[PDB]
Design a protein around this nucleic acid. Sequence first.
RNA 1: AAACAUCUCAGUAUCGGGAGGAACAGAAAACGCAAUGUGAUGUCGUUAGUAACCGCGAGUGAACGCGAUACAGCCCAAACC
RNA 2: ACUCGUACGGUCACUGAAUCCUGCCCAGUGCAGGUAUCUGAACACCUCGUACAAGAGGACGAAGGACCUGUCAACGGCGGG
RNA 3: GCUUUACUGCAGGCUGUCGCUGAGGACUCUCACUCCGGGAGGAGGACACCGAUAGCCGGGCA
Lengths: 194, 56, 237, 92
Amino acid sequence: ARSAYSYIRDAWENPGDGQLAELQWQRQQEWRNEGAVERIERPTRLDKARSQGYKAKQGVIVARVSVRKGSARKRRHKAGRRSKRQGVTRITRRKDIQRVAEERASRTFPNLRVLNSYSVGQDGRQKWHEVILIDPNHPAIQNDDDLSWICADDQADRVFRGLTGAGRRNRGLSGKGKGSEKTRPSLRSNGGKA
Amino acid sequence: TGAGTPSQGKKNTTTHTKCRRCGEKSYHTKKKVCSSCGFGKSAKRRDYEWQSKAGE
Amino acid sequence: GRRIQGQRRGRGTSTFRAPSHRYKADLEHRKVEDGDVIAGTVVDIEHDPARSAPVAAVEFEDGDRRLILAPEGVGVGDELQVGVSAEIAPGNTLPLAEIPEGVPVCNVESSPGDGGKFARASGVNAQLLTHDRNVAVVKLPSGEMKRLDPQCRATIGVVAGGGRTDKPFVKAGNKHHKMKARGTKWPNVRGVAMNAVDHPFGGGGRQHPGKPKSISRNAPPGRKVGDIASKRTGRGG
Amino acid sequence: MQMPRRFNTYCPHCNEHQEHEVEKVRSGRQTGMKWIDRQRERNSGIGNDGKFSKVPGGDKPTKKTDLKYRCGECGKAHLREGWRAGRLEFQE
RNA sequence: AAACAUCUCAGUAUCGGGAGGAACAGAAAACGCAAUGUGAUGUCGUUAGUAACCGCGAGUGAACGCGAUACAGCCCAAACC
RNA sequence: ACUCGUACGGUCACUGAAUCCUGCCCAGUGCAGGUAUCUGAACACCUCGUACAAGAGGACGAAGGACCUGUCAACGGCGGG
RNA sequence: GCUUUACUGCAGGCUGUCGCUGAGGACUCUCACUCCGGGAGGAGGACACCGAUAGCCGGGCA
Ligand SMILES: [Cl-]
Ligand SMILES: [Cl-]
Ligand SMILES: [Cl-]
Ligand SMILES: [Cl-]
Ligand SMILES: [K+]
Ligand SMILES: [Mg+2]
Ligand SMILES: [Mg+2]
Ligand SMILES: [Mg+2]
Ligand SMILES: [Mg+2]
Ligand SMILES: [Mg+2]
Ligand SMILES: [Mg+2]
Ligand SMILES: [Mg+2]
Ligand SMILES: [Mg+2]
Ligand SMILES: [Mg+2]
Ligand SMILES: [Mg+2]
Ligand SMILES: [Mg+2]
Ligand SMILES: [Mg+2]
Ligand SMILES: [Mg+2]
Ligand SMILES: [Mg+2]
Ligand SMILES: [Mg+2]
Ligand SMILES: [Mg+2]
Ligand code: NA
Ligand code: NA
Ligand code: NA
Ligand code: NA
Ligand code: NA
Ligand code: NA
Ligand code: NA
Ligand code: NA
Ligand SMILES: [Sr+2]
Ligand SMILES: [Sr+2]
Ligand SMILES: [Sr+2]
Ligand SMILES: [Sr+2]
Ligand SMILES: [Sr+2]
Ligand SMILES: [Sr+2]
Ligand SMILES: [Sr+2]
Ligand SMILES: [Sr+2]
Ligand SMILES: [Sr+2]
Ligand SMILES: [Sr+2]
Ligand SMILES: [Sr+2]
Ligand SMILES: [Sr+2]
Ligand SMILES: [Sr+2]
Ligand SMILES: [Sr+2]
Ligand SMILES: [Sr+2]
Ligand SMILES: [Sr+2]
């Protein structure tokens, strides 16, 4: 039969309709009054969290992060530039907002490692994402068959090197064939043309 | 008053001093920042790739 | 070119800042719970560096000693009141609603409780004209009819120091001393007297703006100089 | 100059002389779906857009005749070199 | 590019952040020598200055495949408990 | 920043103590206001086209412009016959 | 380096449109949001601010 989780899932396919609509209208009022990174006891989208690796266990942390909406916040050129490199307004950054959110969260919790993240809406001037972080130093986690992999030394600061799911997608690593000629195995090795 | 010799006589201010962190006489005692190693400005050590030829 | 002086101003460097560390206080009305049971006595008259006008130090019943924006005619010993039931006399503060029409007031609040925004300069005053249950009409010093919340507080009378403007500075040195008490760069070098690199009007064999002075409202900073969006110029017509 | 609306001449299709009607070539409308149209969009962005920033050239004092010759029996037309003519008016 | 604006120099120099002894990638919503065919991923040789791009100028420039190197495949979410 | 500031303020410009004065010009350019009608982009909308889409056309029309007015201690002008 | 009704662009301002954004060619309301208030509460209000885009101006800048 349908899991209770599927109901949370199905509700979020249209965050603008039904009860969820009312919840968001109510919630965001409080979120707007919260900081940039607020730790929270429980995921707002349980099905998503569990699906991404979340577990109700010691060493598993969830935090909501908000980031200003829109394109790049760039300063116009103070030195000579050819028309091409004079743009300022319509230029956007190469990292999506979710990635910026994952990094801020990870900065707030220096000892934790980003496991994954997902969206929880936005208003006209900002977007919110909840990030799942794991404590690689807690025994409850060092002994987990599903999460202990994140305790390895080469997993340290994984978010800052683009090793997150959002990181890999944003680096154009989804496709295994056509279109990934310059993304795999890394943007840098391909001369940075991906 | 000329900008040369006559103006050099007014120089008796102490700015750069021996730095606690790196030992170079580069700790600006008025800014409390080392122009050589970055002490007072950054926990990380002051460094730049332009301090050497690009391919070296 | 180089940024014009008006642009250097915005960075808020020392040269353009007001000597705030030398200023006394921001003569904002006292906050009263209600009842109006708040009265104090003028303990002294002082000079206000930021406005070149006198200010009165008042000691209130509940023990609060604060400077106040004094109207003309307030002296030591006098007793002032601040509240809805305050008596209708010079130097007293109360909401416009309580003020009788045709009475000159000063230090008028823009939004009830802000502390006073209008008519604060030497010898000026707003004129309370129309009353109502929804809007109090005041005539500001510039002659503009302003619609205000009758709940906006004000002080009866005109501001002290009137006529300050009637005497000429006579010499640069006097202007100098006053300018040193404000957030202003003085003296003033004419734009036409500068190099082209320094101002839209600079350059040229003889001095003259090489363009019409009336600049558009939409002009970007650096170019908005001269007569800003003038509806007209001159004295004629 | 004057030009007869119809006259006998060689029709390269029937491969024999037949009566033709002369008409000035009317400009066909563009679709905006040609390769060049897509290149202009793909290559135009911020700043100068190379060739797509160039604007229409001038004019020659006189243009060459631009006509269609339609065979009166097979209905098919053919083109011919044109010749500079300040004005071209048809007779009848 | 014998000027120069797209283009080029070049994702180079330089800057911010971060890991390791190596990094990154990686068990197909692949490929498409179209097949009764191949079978995770790097890398090397080649495919090839080819296809593709481009004031269609100057210039820029892959991939599949093939020969090699080395080979390795698994774990969750949910269903039912 | 101005600003512990509020039109007797402070911003932007021109002229340059006092004294006697400061004429004519609004066509061009600038600024500003208005504007029946004209022109005026995109989204949405309608028609054609496409089993869809590209695309073509229509209707509506903001600022702006056309047009009208104000303005020279606004740029400036005050000749030839 | 400087100028401008040189060429081409870029900031910036004005203006429309979409999102924020809700209820009953002109309108009312309150619940988001904004502002004032120490607070209660008051003012405003689906506008404004902000994100996106479109037209106009644009030697302020390249
Ligand atoms: Cl991390
Ligand atoms: Cl003054
Ligand atoms: Cl012809
Ligand atoms: Cl194959
Ligand atoms: K260049
Ligand atoms: Mg298991
Ligand atoms: Mg005050
Ligand atoms: Mg000073
Ligand atoms: Mg001067
Ligand atoms: Mg000079
Ligand atoms: Mg200039
Ligand atoms: Mg002059
Ligand atoms: Mg002069
Ligand atoms: Mg060249
Ligand atoms: Mg590699
Ligand atoms: Mg050439
Ligand atoms: Mg290249
Ligand atoms: Mg291929
Ligand atoms: Mg002089
Ligand atoms: Mg505030
Ligand atoms: Mg220039
Ligand atoms: Na961290
Ligand atoms: Na392109
Ligand atoms: Na050359
Ligand atoms: Na050159
Ligand atoms: Na090109
Ligand atoms: Na083969
Ligand atoms: Na005129
Ligand atoms: Na020079
Ligand atoms: Sr670290
Ligand atoms: Sr000197
Ligand atoms: Sr000397
Ligand atoms: Sr000295
Ligand atoms: Sr420091
Ligand atoms: Sr460094
Ligand atoms: Sr105040
Ligand atoms: Sr206050
Ligand atoms: Sr000049
Ligand atoms: Sr006159
Ligand atoms: Sr493009
Ligand atoms: Sr362009
Ligand atoms: Sr010609
Ligand atoms: Sr294998
Ligand atoms: Sr004089
Ligand atoms: Sr005029």
